């Protein structure tokens, strides 16, 4: 969900770092303007299309 | 970086845990409703307290981000929406006492039983027998003394309750920046940043007071005519001069007055439209009621229901060990659920509610490309009135014929349409005042003008002035009548019931008008039209991103709510009774007292 640029093309990316976006770096923990880059679908039978 | 780029970060996020949660906690709910079991009120209470827990740190940390920085507009709709809802400023104790009150509030509404004097032997309660008797029952002494009991054995222990709840709703609006909790309410309607747009708390008591003016000659009209039929009824108790006695109104607090089309028909002798025989003969069930609603939806343009509506949803009370709610509701589970709780009978009430309910259901779907802090109605009005207009269309003679329900042989003439505006009179017009004096009573309450030893004074004071009903029994203060309401006990704003109302009027006359339609306002269909279809589901979509004024200019091309279309729609009604009022005398008297 977050990446710092684009991608080029046919590229594939595992590198999980958290994603910092505030002045102050957080030297890579969860809290304030610092997320898990990965993000996480959620399936169920009751969904629609 | 900028502020507006870590917003939008912190948004993205938010979006996407929101989704998942608010599924979790709507589908614990809906096991509940279809499955009444006490571990599904287990699964309530988990999914609710995880839910409203989030809500919480999410406020919190929202507050980093100053408004000031934001000139998207969007944006900080979305970061207004999400601090203000979850925060809460009381201190603890104060916080579980305002908690307690509240739940001992429902608790005691919920509970509360009335009986027979004198004997403790059997009792009832309000939902099964009460509401009955005041429909249907016609002699004096038990309505009068049935409406005496409930309000004595309720109001009076609500009344310290009321006063305490009264205090400490005020510091949490005087916490905030809020003048008082009447403004808290009064902020819905409140539109800032927009040039052109811009509408003021203030403006709404100006607005609401100068729009009831108008549509005073009309009430009053009805009013007299109303009284001079009643005489019939009850002679010696009513009087030519004096307002309606207020237990003689067909219902618990006199809201609706549906229940007096029997005791004030026009035209007895002709017969009234009625279609539950053509069913029968026809053996309708609960489908085909719906796929009939369903085309009427299609005919406009606008899709029709996905698989999994058909699938999940029901329609038919299951009975047996399965007990469920009746209530007829639209529920949106969100990520592409809708669905549809209601136990259906072969009836015309039943037929009339499954287009209601369906056009809740599309205006969901409507806005579903919205953000999910926008997943909502432009204000408290707009969503009651798009699902009320299209009852109109459905109950119109031509759709009936159309269908096929009524047969061709059916003609129309005066009494047909004087019988089926009145109908609709009594249940519309007649709400408007009681729905008016309540809000503006509770708005004094608030402001605190009002002392707390003049609470009864001044509230069947107005009572005779606006409404012109007056009370068959005094009332000292230890009696808290506004109490014995529903909406008033669960801390529900009322004034939705009065916006709503001149909503639906200036939409249907638009549509009409867009529909190239010709003659009475009342007989008009929209089935075959696409081009009012279109127009609608222009503002469908919107959702929450514009301000509603300019939603309403969409539409009809106002920036504010008239009273026109509605007394256009009930002109033939008040010639006729302008007619009949010759002889009788218009305009109540306040100083008749029925106790002598
Ligand atoms: C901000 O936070 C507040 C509360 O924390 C949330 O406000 C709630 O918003 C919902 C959505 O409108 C409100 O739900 C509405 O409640 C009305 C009140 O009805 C009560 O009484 C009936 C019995 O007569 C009960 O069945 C019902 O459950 C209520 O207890 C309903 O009348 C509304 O239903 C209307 O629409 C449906 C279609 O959706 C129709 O079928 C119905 O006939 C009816 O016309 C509706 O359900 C809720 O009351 C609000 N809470 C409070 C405390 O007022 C906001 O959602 C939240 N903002 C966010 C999350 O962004
Ligand atoms: C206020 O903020 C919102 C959200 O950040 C802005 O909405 C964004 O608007 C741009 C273009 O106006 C959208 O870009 C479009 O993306 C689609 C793919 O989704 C692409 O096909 C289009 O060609 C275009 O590039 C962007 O998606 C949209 N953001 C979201 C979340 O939908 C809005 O523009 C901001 N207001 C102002 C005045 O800039
Ligand atoms: C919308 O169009 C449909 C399609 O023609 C109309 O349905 C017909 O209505 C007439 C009555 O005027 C019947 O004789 C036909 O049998 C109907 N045909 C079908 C296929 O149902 C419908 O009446 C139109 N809506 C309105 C309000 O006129
Ligand atoms: C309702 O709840 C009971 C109790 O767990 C369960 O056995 C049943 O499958 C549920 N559903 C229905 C339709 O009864
Ligand atoms: C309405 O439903 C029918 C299935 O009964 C479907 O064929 C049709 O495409 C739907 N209408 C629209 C506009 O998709
Ligand atoms: C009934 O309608 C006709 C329309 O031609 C009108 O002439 C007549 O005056 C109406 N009668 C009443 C009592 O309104």
Same mark, same amino acid.
């Given at each position: ?49 | ?34 499955? +009444? ?19 919480? &740190? ?16 969007? !944006?900080? #709709? ?53 509401? &009955? ?8 002494? $038990? ?20 006063? $305490? ?24 309607? $409140? ?102 609603? $369903? ?15 058909? &699938? ?8 047996? !060990? ?98 089926? #505006? ?5 249940? +519309? ?65 009322? +004034? ?76 033939? #009604? ?23």
């Amino acid at each position: 969900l977050f990446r710092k640029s684009k991608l080029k093309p046919f590229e594939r990316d595992i590198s999980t770092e958290i994603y910092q976006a505030g002045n102050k770096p957080c030297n890579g923990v969860a809290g304030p303007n610092c997320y898990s880059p990965l993000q996480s679908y959620g399936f169920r039978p009751t969904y629609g299309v | 970086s900028t502020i507006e780029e870590q917003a939008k970060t912190f948004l993205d996020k938010f979006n996407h845990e929101a989704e998942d949660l608010f599924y979790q906690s709507s589908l614990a709910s809906w096991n509940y409703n279809t499955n +009444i079991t006490e571990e599904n009120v287990q699964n309530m209470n988990n999914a609710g307290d995880k839910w409203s827990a989030f809500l919480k &740190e999410q406020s919190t940390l929202a507050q980093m981000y100053p408004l000031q920085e934001i000139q998207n507009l969007t !944006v900080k #709709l979305q970061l207004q929406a999400l601090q203000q809802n979850g925060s809460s400023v009381l201190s603890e104790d104060k916080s579980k006492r305002l908690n307690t009150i509240l739940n001992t509030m429902s608790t005691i509404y919920s509970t509360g039983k009335v009986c027979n004097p004198d004997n403790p032997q059997e009792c009832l309660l309000l939902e099964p027998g009460l509401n &009955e008797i005041m429909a249907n029952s016609l002699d004096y002494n $038990e309505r009068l003394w049935a409406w005496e009991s409930w309000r004595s054995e309720v109001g009076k222990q609500l009344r310290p309750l009321y006063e $305490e709840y009264v205090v400490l709703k005020n510091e949490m609006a005087r916490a905030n920046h809020y003048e008082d909790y009447g403004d808290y309410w009064r902020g819905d309607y $409140e539109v800032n940043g927009v040039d052109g747009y811009d509408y003021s708390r203030g403006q709404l008591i100006e607005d609401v007071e100068h729009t009831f003016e108008e549509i005073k000659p009309l009430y009053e009209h009805l009013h007299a005519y109303v009284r001079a039929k009643l005489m019939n009824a009850y002679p010696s108790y009513i009087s030519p001069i004096g307002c309606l006695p207020a237990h003689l109104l067909g219902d618990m607090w006199g809201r609706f007055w549906t229940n007096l089309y029997s005791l004030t028909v026009p035209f007895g002798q002709k017969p009234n439209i009625d279609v539950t025989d053509a069913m029968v003969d026809q053996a309708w069930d609960a489908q085909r009621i719906f796929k009939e609603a $369903e085309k009427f939806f299609v005919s406009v343009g606008l899709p029709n229901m996905t698989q999994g509506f058909w &699938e999940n949803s029901m329609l038919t009370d299951p009975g047996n !060990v399965q007990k469920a709610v009746c209530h007829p509701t639209a529920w949106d589970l969100g990520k592409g659920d809708f669905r549809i709780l209601m136990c259906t009978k072969v009836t015309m009430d039943d037929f009339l509610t499954a287009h209601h309910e369906m056009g809740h259901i599309q205006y969901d779907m409507a806005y579903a490309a919205q953000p999910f802090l926008l997943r909502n109605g432009a204000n408290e009005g707009f969503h009651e009135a798009v699902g009320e207009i299209m009852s109109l269309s459905a109950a119109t003679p031509k759709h009936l014929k159309s269908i096929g329900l009524l047969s061709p042989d059916f003609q129309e003439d005066n009494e047909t349409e004087i019988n089926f #505006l009145l109908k609709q009179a009594l249940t +519309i017009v007649g709400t408007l005042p009681f729905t008016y004096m309540l809000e503006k009573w509770r708005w004094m309450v608030f402001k605190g003008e009002i002392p707390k030893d003049q609470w009864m004074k001044k509230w069947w004071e107005m009572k005779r002035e606006i409404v012109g009903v007056v009370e068959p029994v005094p009332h000292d203060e230890t009696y808290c009548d506004p109490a014995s309401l529903f909406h008033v006990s669960n801390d529900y704003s009322f +004034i939705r019931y009065y916006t709503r109302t001149l909503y639906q009027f200036q939409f249907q006359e638009a549509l009409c008008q867009a529909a190239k339609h010709e003659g009475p306002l009342h007989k008009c269909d929209i089935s075959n039209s696409t081009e009012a279809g279109q127009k609608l589901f222009n503002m469908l979509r919107l959702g929450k991103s514009e301000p509603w004024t300019l939603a309403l200019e969409n539409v009809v091309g106002a920036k504010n709510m008239n009273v026109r279309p509605l007394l256009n729609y009930f002109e033939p #009604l008040f010639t006729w009774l302008k007619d009949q009022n010759k002889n009788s005398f218009v305009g109540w008297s306040t100083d008749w007292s029925p106790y002598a």
